[PDB]
Subunit: 405 residues, 4 copies
C-alpha cells in the first residue's frame, strides 16, 4: 500500500490496473492459455492482491473454495508424519478435513480447548507444523487471543494460521495480531450475495523460515524449480509455494467468472459488513430483552465470556452470525423457524439475505443429545446469520414469530 | 409490497421467488426459448419487479440500456405527428435522441427552461403526448418541481415521464410526486460498479387512460393481441404495451447475464448510495472552503438556486454528481485533471470508483466557447462523480492536485 | 482476409488478436467505460469483424437481437416519408416491425410476391430507400433470385438488404450476389445452442452513395460529427452510421457476455451447419417417401419450384428448417407432436436440439382459416427445425410417432 | 440411456431436463445454497450425467480441473501406505502429482513401460490400489492395450483408471474395454475452445468391491454417513464417495458458469472431434511426405508400432495431437515455429485453434539433453495440436514455414 490508502479505497482499487484498451472494469479472462511472447489469470490476480491488501498482508492466492484454500495452506507446510494443533471448536467442514481426509494422508491434528492459549503449547511436539484457529468460532461464536497464540507458535518456530471467514478484514486483520497466514471462504462475506464460491490464502511476510529450521522445503534449493529457494521470495514465499506445488498438482483453481464476482463484492465489502453488524447489534438487543429468549451467544455482549477479547480485537463489531436458545427449548426453536417470513431456512451464512437454522431438526437431525453436544450443538440451539435487509423489518418478523411459540 | 417492507428489505428480496430446486440465488436463464407446456425471462423478471417495487410503482420492464428504455417509453405513447415537451437541460444522449432520431420519425420535441413549470404548459398543444424531465440535470445539476409539472401534465390529460437515473429510488421516488412513468439507466447506480448496461421503465398505475382520451391505442381493443385493451391491465398497462409492441418489434432486450449483475447491485443499492452521498457532502464541504474553487453546483448548498427543491424532494441528499469551477478557469481545470492520482479521467458517472472530467479539454475539446455554452458547458466547468472510496483519500487527492494549479 | 483464408479458418480466427497478457481466448470486457487516455467493446468488436469476414463483407456492427439489427438497418436509411419494398413472405416478427412499429413512424413498406423479381421493380417510387428479403423465407421456405433483385435495386440507385439468418454465411453469401447489407439474428445458427441473443449488420462496401443521390445523409458533412461525411468511410460507411446514430441514440447494445458466447458458436459454425444440413437431407428423404406425409417444402428437392435457385445459390444445401403436412391434416399434425420423444415443442429454430411446432394449434391457434393462409399457414402445416442429434435417432422418433397418427 | 440413443443425441440431450419455467437451455445456477424444503448443483449435474452417458458409464462427478479430477480419483481409493502402478508415459502434470504431492502423503507410485502389459503385473503388490494409464500418451502419442491391462487389474482385485482426455468418449470408451473409472480434463476437447477449465470422473459400475476385499472403506458402514455402505450404491459408489469425502473436504468444485460452458462444448463435441481428426489425418499425410520431416509419431501411420491398437480400439481415429522432428533438428524446429502464421505458440492442447510447441527451446529450455530424455523429449521434438481451421490453410502455413527452415 505505497499510497497509504484507507480500507474503503483499497477494496475498490487495490490490485487493479488499466490495460491497453482503457477498460475501467477488470476484464473476465475466461481463458485456459496464453501465447508465449503467464502462469496466473489476470482477473484472479486482482482478487489475490486486493484481499491481501485488505488483510495488510504481502501476497495472496485464490482457489475454488474455502475448503480448497485451507487444504492448500496445510499441505503447503505439512506432509506425512507432520502434525497440526487446532482449536477444537472448528467449523464442521474443517474438522472433517482435518480428522478424515488429512489424517488418512499421515497428518495428525490435535484439537484443543482454545479458551486457554496454553492448551496449544501443551500439544506441540517436534512434529507440529502450525497452529490453526478461526477468528470467530462456529457454532460457538467464540473468540481467541490471537496475540497469545501467535506468541506460542513463534516461540516454537512454527506458523500461526487463522481462518478469518466470519470476521472479514474489515472487522479484524489477524496478520497484525500474530498470525502468519490468513485463509478465507470468499464464498461468504467477500462475495456477499450467496452466488459465488471462492477461497483465498494471504501471507503476512514476517515469518523467518530460516531461523525456524522446521520448514526445510522453504530453505533448500528445489531442483524441481531450478534450485529456487522459496524463502528468498520474502513476502511471497508461502503463496508462491502453494501456486507452484499444491495448486499446480491438485488444481482447485477458481473460475475467472467467480473471481469477477468476488471483485464486485469486494468493492462494497465494508459497506455491507457495516450494515450486517449494525443490523445484528439491533437484532441482538431486541432478542436479549425478549422474555422467550433463554440465552444468546454474541461476544460483544457485556456479560459474554469473550467480551474482553471483543473489545481488544474487534473495534468495529463481532460480525453478523450468532446463536440463541428459546425458553421453550427444541420445540420452540423449531416453531420459530416455521413462522418466520423473511429469514430463509438453510445451512449457509453471510448472504445479503438473512438466514436461520435449527441444526437439531435439520443438518444434525440424525444425532442424539450427546452426539449433538460433541458437535457444539444443543437441542435448543438456533443459529442466525443477519443480512442487510431493513433491521425493523427483521425485528418485526422475529417479534411476530416469537408470539407463535 | 403487501407486507409493507422498507426499502432495504425490498432491494434484497422484492420480485424474487424460490424455484423447485430451492436455489437461494436467482438462476441465470441464459436461454432464448421455452418448451410449450412463458413470455418473459425469469432472471430479468426479478429486475422488473424489484426496481418497480423500489420506485413504489406497479410494474416494470427492463431493456438493454437507459437509452433503449427512454426510446421505448416515448414510442409507447408517441408516433408520427405527436409531440413531447422536455426540459432544455437534458443529458446529451437523450437530447440527441429527441432532436435527431425521434425527429426523423415525425416526433417533435419542444425544449423549455425547466426552472419555471409554466414553460411546460406554454408548449403544450393538441399533439402533446408527454412531459419529460430528469430528476437531477447533467451537467447543470439542476432540480425541477415534480408536483407542479405533474399537475400541468394531468390538467391536460397527458402523462409525466421522469428519468430518475441520477437520483435512484432511494433519494427520490418521482411516482409519488406527480410522475406516471420513471425510466432508469440501470447502467449507473443500480449496477453500481461500471460493468453492466441496462435500462428500466417503471409505471405508477394512477393514470386514467380512458378519462384522458388522448391515448386511443391504450383504450381500443387490438386484433393483434386478440381484443386486448392495454388499459384493462391497470397498473401494468404501460409496461405491458412496451413489452407487447416496441420491445417485441425493435428488440432492445437485456442479457440475462446483465440482469443477474443488476440484481447483485440492487441488493446493496441503498448501502452504496448512502456512502456516495456522505462522501459527496464531505468533498463538497472541502471544496466550498478551498481558496482555488470559484463556484460549485450542488443543490444541497444553502445558497444554491435549487436548495428549496432539495429540501422538498431530496430528504436523503441529492446524489454524488456535481460540478465546479476553479479560480484559474479553463487552464486550472485542465491542469487539475493531470495531477489527480485516485480519480479516474473518463466521461461516465455513478461507478464505485470516483470519476472526473473537464469537458472543454476532452469530450468537448473541439468546441469554441459559444458551442460549449450551447452544450451546457463553460471553459472552466469540471464534473465530478464521487465513488465509495474513503473520503479522506479522495479529499487528499484533490488537495494535492489543487496545490499544483 | 488478405492472406486468403478459407471459411473455417476465419470462423476460428478472424477479428481476434492477442492482447498484452497473451490470453489466447478473447476476454469478456464487461465494462461500461474506458479511461479517457470508447463506444466499441473489444469483445463485441471481434464479433463485428468475424461475421463481416464470413459474409465476405467490409464491416460489421452487433446489436442486442436480430430484431434490433433489422430495425437499425432500416432506420439507418429510412425516415418519415420514406418507403421500403419487402417480400411478403417475411418472418412474422419482421412483418410486425415493418407493418406496425415503423409504419407508425412514417416509413411505408410495400409487400410484394418475391417469386417474381419484377414485383419489386413495380413498387419502387421516388421514396423507396431499400429492397428487403430473407435468404430463406419462413414459413414458406422459399428462395429468391438475389442477383435479379439486386440488379433492380441498383438500377434505381437504392440498396438491397438480405436477412441471411436461415442461410448463415456458410450456405450463401448474399453480398456476393447483389446485396449491399446482410443482417443476422445471431440468436439462431451463429449462437447455435438456443442460449444467447444477438443481431449483426454486415455491409459489402460496393454501393456508391454519391452516385446514387438518394442518400444525402451519407454525403453531406454533419456538424454534430465535425463535418464527417459517412460516404468517405468507404466499406465502413453504413455500419459506422448505425453506430454513430441509431445505435448511439436508441441503445440496442449487446452484452459483452453474449458477444463472447457468439464467438464460441462462430468457432464451430460450419461444423454444426454441415451436420444440420446432412441431418435434414436424411430426414426430408425419409419423410418425403413416407405414406403419411402429404407434402414437404424443402427447396433442394428436385420437384420444388425453387430447385433452380437452390442449385444456383445454395451449393452446400438449403439449411435445416422446413415445413410439411400430413395426410391426416390438422388432427394428424397435432397427434404427431404428442407422440414425439426427441423433438422439442416450441416456436424457435436453429437450436442444436431438434424442434417442431404445429402453428395452427399454438402460436396461431386463435386464427380462422382465412386468418392463417394470410400468414402463410395452413391447418395442416408443421414446421421442423433439425438439430445435430444422430439422424437415425431422429428418424426413429419420427417413425414411431407417425405410426400412431 | 434407457431408449438406446446414439452418441450425437446423447451429447445434445443426456442429463438435461426441462424445469418448471420450460427453459430449453440449462440455467446457470450461480448459487451457493438451496432453501431446505444436497448442494449438488443443477447446472453441473447435467455435465455429470452427460459425460457419464457419453462414456457409457453409470455415474459421473465434475471438479474444477482435470488435475483435481485425477487427484480425487486417486485419493478416493488410496491413502497413506497405499500404492499405484502407472504408465511412465504420463502427462507431465500428472507425473508431478504422483511423484511430488501424493508421494509426500504416503502414496507411492511405480512407473512402468506400458508397451508391455506384463510390466503392470510386475509392480503389483498388496499395497496396490489401482492401475493408471492415459488413452493416448503424451508426448509419445503411444497407445495401450486396455483389455490386457484391465484383465491384470481385475485378476488382482484392483481397479483400472484411464485418463481419456486425449481420446474423448467419441474416439474410445475405456469403460467398455476393461477400465472401471475414466477421468477427463474437460479443459481440453470437451470445452473445445480454450476458455474453461474442468475435470470429470466417470465410473463404469462393473467392479465388485465386496469380492475384491482391498477396498474396506467401500464395504464398511460409515458412521460419518449414518452407516452408509458405499458399495451398496451400485454404479454410483465411486463417484458418490468422491462427492461425499474428497470433494466435500478439499473443495475443488467447478463454477456453475464453467459447467454451462462445458455443456455448450458437449453439444458440438463429436462434430469438432471428427474435424480435428480429419484435419490431423490430412496434415500428417502431408508432413510424412515432406522432405524436411525426419520422423512423425502418430499411431494410425502404417509403420507405427501402435497401428494395431489404433485399429482395435480407435475405429474413428486417434485424435489431433502428434509429434514430429525435422531434418534440421532443434534449430529447424525452433525456426518452424517462428515462421508459422496460423499455429499459436503455447503449451496447451485441444483448442479450436491449432497450437504448436518446441519444448527444448521453451518449457524445458533449462534442461540438458539427458534431463530432456527423462521426460520423453528430444531436442528436435515438436508437438502439434491440430484445430478445426481449414486443413488446406494449415497445410499451406506449414509448407511456407518449412520452406524457410
Ligand atoms: O454491490 C455488490 O455487492 C454486488 C456484488 C456483485 C455485483 N455487485
Ligand atoms: O458450439 C460450440 O462449440 C460452442 C461452445 C460454447 C458455446 N458454443
Amino acid at each position: 500500500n505505497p499510497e497509504n490508502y484507507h480500507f474503503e479505497t483499497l477494496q475498490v482499487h487495490a490490485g487493479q490496473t488499466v490495460d491497453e484498451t482503457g477498460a475501467r472494469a477488470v476484464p473476465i479472462y475466461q481463458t485456459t492459455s496464453y501465447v508465449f511472447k503467464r502462469l496466473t489469470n489476470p482477473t484472479t490476480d486482482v482478487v489475490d492482491k486486493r484481499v491481501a491488501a485488505l488483510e495488510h498482508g504481502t501476497a495472496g492466492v485464490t482457489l475454488a473454495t474455502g475448503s480448497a484454500a485451507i487444504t492448500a495452506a496445510i499441505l503447503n507446510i505439512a506432509q506425512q508424519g507432520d502434525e497440526i494443533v487446532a482449536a477444537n471448536t472448528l467449523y464442521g467442514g474443517t474438522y472433517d478435513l482435518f480428522s478424515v481426509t488429512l489424517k488418512k494422508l499421515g497428518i495428525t491434528t490435535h484439537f484443543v480447548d482454545p479458551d486457554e492459549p496454553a492448551n496449544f503449547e501443551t500439544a506441540i511436539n517436534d512434529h507440529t507444523k502450525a497452529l490453526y484457529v478461526e477468528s470467530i468460532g462456529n457454532p460457538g461464536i467464540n473468540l481467541v487471543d490471537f496475540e497469545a497464540i501467535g506468541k506460542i507458535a513463534h516461540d516454537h518456530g512454527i506458523i500461526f494460521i487463522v481462518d478469518n471467514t466470519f470476521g472479514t478484514p474489515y472487522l479484524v486483520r489477524p496478520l497484525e495480531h500474530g498470525a502468519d497466514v490468513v485463509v478465507h471462504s470468499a464464498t461468504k462475506f467477500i462475495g456477499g450475495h450467496g452466488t459465488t464460491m471462492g477461497g483465498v490464502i494471504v501471507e503476512g511476510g514476517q515469518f523467518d523460515w530460516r531461523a525456524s529450521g522446521k520448514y526445510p522445503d522453504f530453505t533448500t534449493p528445489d531442483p524441481q524449480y531450478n534450485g529456487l529457494v522459496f524463502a528468498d521470495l520474502g513476502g511471497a514465499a508461502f503463496t508462491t509455494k502453494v501456486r507452484a506445488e499444491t495448486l499446480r498438482d491438485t488444481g482447485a483453481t477458481i473460475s475467472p467468472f467467480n473471481s469477477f464476482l468476488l471483485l464486485q463484492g469486494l468493492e462494497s465489502l465494508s459497506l455491507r459488513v457495516e450494515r450486517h453488524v449494525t443490523n445484528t447489534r439491533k437484532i441482538v438487543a431486541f432478542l436479549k430483552a425478549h422474555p422467550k429468549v433463554a440465552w444468546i451467544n454474541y461476544p460483544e455482549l457485556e456479560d459474554s465470556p469473550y467480551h474482553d477479547l471483543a473489545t481488544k480485537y474487534f473495534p468495529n463489531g463481532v460480525g453478523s452470525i450468532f446463536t440463541l436458545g428459546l425458553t421453550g427449548g427444541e420445540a420452540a426453536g423449531k416453531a420459530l423457524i416455521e413462522h418466520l417470513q423473511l429469514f430463509s431456512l438453510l445451512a449457509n451464512v453471510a448472504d445479503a439475505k438473512s438466514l436461520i437454522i435449527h441444526p437439531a431438526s435439520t443438518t444434525h437431525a440424525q444425532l442424539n443429545e450427546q452426539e449433538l453436544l460433541a458437535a457444539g450443538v444443543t437441542p435448543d440451539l438456533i443459529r442466525i446469520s443477519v443480512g442487510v435487509e431493513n433491521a425493523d423489518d427483521l425485528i418485526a418478523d422475529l417479534d411476530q414469530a416469537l408470539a407463535q411459540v
